[PDB]
Amino acid sequence: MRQTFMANESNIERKWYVIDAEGQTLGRLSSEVASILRGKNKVTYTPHVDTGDYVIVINASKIEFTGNKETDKVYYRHSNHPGGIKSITAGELRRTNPERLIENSIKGMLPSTRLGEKQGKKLFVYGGAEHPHAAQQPENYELRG
Amino acid sequence: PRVKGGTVTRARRKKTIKLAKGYFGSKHTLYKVAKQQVMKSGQYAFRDRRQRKRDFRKLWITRINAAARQHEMSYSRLMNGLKKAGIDINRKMLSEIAISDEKAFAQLVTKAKDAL
Amino acid sequence: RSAVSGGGRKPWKQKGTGRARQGTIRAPQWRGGGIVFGPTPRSYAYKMPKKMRRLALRSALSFKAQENGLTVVDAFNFEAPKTKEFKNVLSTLEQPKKVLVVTENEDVNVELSARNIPGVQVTTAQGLNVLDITNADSLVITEAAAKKVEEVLG
Amino acid sequence: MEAKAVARTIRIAPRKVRLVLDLIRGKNAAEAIAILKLTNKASSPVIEKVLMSALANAEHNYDMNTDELVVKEAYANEGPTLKRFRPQGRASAINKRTSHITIVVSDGKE
Amino acid sequence: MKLHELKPAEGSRKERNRVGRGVATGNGKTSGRGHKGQKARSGGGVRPG
Amino acid sequence: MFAIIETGGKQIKVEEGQEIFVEKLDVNEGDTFTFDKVLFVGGDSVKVGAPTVEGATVTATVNKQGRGKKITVFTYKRRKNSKRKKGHRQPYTKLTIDKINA
Amino acid sequence: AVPKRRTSKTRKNKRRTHFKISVPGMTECPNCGEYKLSHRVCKNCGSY
RNA sequence: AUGGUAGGAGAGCGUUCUAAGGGCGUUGAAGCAUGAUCGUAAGGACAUGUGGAGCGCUUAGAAGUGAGAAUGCCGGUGUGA
RNA sequence: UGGGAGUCAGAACAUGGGUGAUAAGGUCCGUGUUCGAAAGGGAAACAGCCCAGACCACCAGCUAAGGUCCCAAAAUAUAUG
RNA sequence: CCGAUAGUGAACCAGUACCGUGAGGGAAAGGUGAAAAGCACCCCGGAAGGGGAGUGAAAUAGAACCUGAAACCGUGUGCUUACAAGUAGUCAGAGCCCGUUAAUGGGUGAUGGCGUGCCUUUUGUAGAAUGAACCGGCGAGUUACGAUUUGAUGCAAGGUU
After folding, report:
1. How far is CA F12 from the centre of its chain?
2. Domain map (residue ranges) of chain F
């Protein structure tokens, strides 16, 4: 074990970013957001610690699908009761709780570990152009093509 | 003449028990399941000594990609430029330079760019 | 298992109910007894050719002579046994702790004199052996015994 | 200064004696005695005997004052068991277990 | 020679092969016999001819 | 200020006064070794060798030609009576840098 | 009907965490003698 | 050149005993316990506690010479509780 | 030439064939490979398929099969549909 | 040759306790110390037990008496743990505590990656195929005689009893 840097608390500094979902595609936004949340954009990335920044998504109702995903692309869940399977379409979920849509899409791109859950707790997603987190002084972030 | 099984069984088992220090419950008290774990432990260590190198190269490459995308460049094109410019420098040393002295990393990113 | 006392009957039925299948309490895996392959009364002696025997004796004596561990005297004049006098004799002759003394045929007086001293052994020319030759560090002979061994080994 | 008392080969099981021993560990002697008087378990008077023996040892052999003492250590260990072939059932075995009780009491100084 | 400096002639003596004493010998479990059959059995084998 | 040297079959990043551990060399304790293959030099000025920098040595002083901690190499094949146990102690040499030239 | 695996020390002592005795009340006898059991004129010098 | 099961070949580590030599021991032997030690492996030392009389080393020689499994045998002790 | 063996339950894949129903993870032959007795990377996991044969260290590098949105290393590359 | 699971079944209470109608079968069980000097006396307690005192070189040598292993049962503490899916380890790795046969040290382990026990039998077993509750002890290619073939040595047209 020669020299390789290993970030820890007392080394790492987390920031606050704001991303506008208007006119954007769901998965193509969510991949980049997951990368930000996990810290792949940082040179001090270490996987056994939560290097990574905070992210704010604002509009979330102008999010766009392609094709007929509005009526196809059904989300399922199960209550662990018999015949307790339930369904809902993506357009329905967009006009009703569009924040859950994006947050679940991003938590699906994050891993299902303890650190992954902590990293997904750093995602604040809203409906509409206003957010409360002005005290944290967030910077606007433009997505890469 | 007769020879009885004295002290060698006990020594042989005891040093395995001692190798099994820190294990959960019966796996630091009982010879059979302790021995079973120590063997497994050595096999795991044999393969992990080799997984280590892969994992660390993976880490260095991730860091270099991050450092390059700040200068609007991918890992792939950066390393092609380095190879063409002659640089025979490790990914590890690259990562450490990118963390410590960003200026030098920019300075050789310029060379990677102008070699294309 | 055949010589251990008892063990005639089968201790339980072949199927039992939930037990291992056994045939006698004196089987070898039982504490009671029954040894499988142990020692047996026998002998370890073996023979080899007479020529080899003679060669071994000659080689031993030649080693003892070329190591300057050979001494030859005239006769032993012991009219009675005296361990003390034999001790003084082995003091005069600068002999080590281990020494073999070879008479021609038999001298009970010198035998009795040297019997009780540690390291000392007494032998006849006919009764020489490679073991008590090699164990010794020095070898004192009478002239007659030397000639006798010379003729019977030459 | 520590005064100790042990009672060996008591015909009660350690699992049963330890339940009541756990209440008096770290207590003052008077309140421990009270707890033992107010607990209705078979081992309470036995433990009381041991405790009072320890306090008497402190008062006689070490000349300590019994008003400012506390139970420092209190434990039960296993003694030798007795095997009994239960005839009432169907050829079963019954182990009568036994305990070595120990309590030590201190003033809290040196 | 000396009894405390005894040495046999070179090539005169070998150690016997001890069967049934673990894996690393190469003669441990089956003791050279293979797995099953008539020849694996004690007193087994078939008579000559 | 700092330098990238190549010794063994690998690259090391060094500063002055630093202690390093390196694959075995053919020198003795107390002696002085000079690394000649330098790839990069940093600090105020920067020098980037294509392979190397046409000069640019690094002097160091040797200590402790020693052996590493033992590792026990164990392997087994489960249902087959086949295992192997070996020991290994890798040699190293320790050095302390005294000066880097450029 | 029978256990398929033995119980470990951990599981045993986890199960034995609610298996203990509570503490009695012990209102100290204001009248005389040893400490009285609560709402009990104890045979051993109690005055509840 | 060096993956490896039936299997063939080779070289070794340890155990009890014997011969010889040379040694250790109430200023504390063997056993037991602990340790961050050495050796490519089997395995070998050293130090400290406990114990209170025998035991190593070198070379050779003999074997009741190495166990984790046999619904194995004998004892102790658990689990269910 | 001689000393010592073990083995005589085989499996899949591809290809040439019988049988079966141009059914079977079927069965019987033949020609190759792998497993058996072969770890490693890929095929989501998966003895038999693709790559490739582990003497031991290394926080060094080049490639194979398969790949470069995130899970999860590498092109949200170019150009044309 | 054995040295108390050995060696007689039996080192002691042995062909005895015990089993069986009977013929018969058939165990377990050794060690204070040099010397009994085998704990006067006091205290708690109904007594058993103990704590002092004392004998002794030694009483964690006190008759359940040399040594006193492991399983197993406990008491104290340093690190750690109540949003977590687990063949329990392994590689990486902060923080906290310690300080060695002093050498690129030790203990714990927030978190990340990898990872379906052993043996036997099988074409093939994580296997829902077998076996093992745990620990300790015992527990299986041996000896005689002969044949054959390799190595060693001696002598050699002779060699050998």
Report:
1. 7
2. 1-102
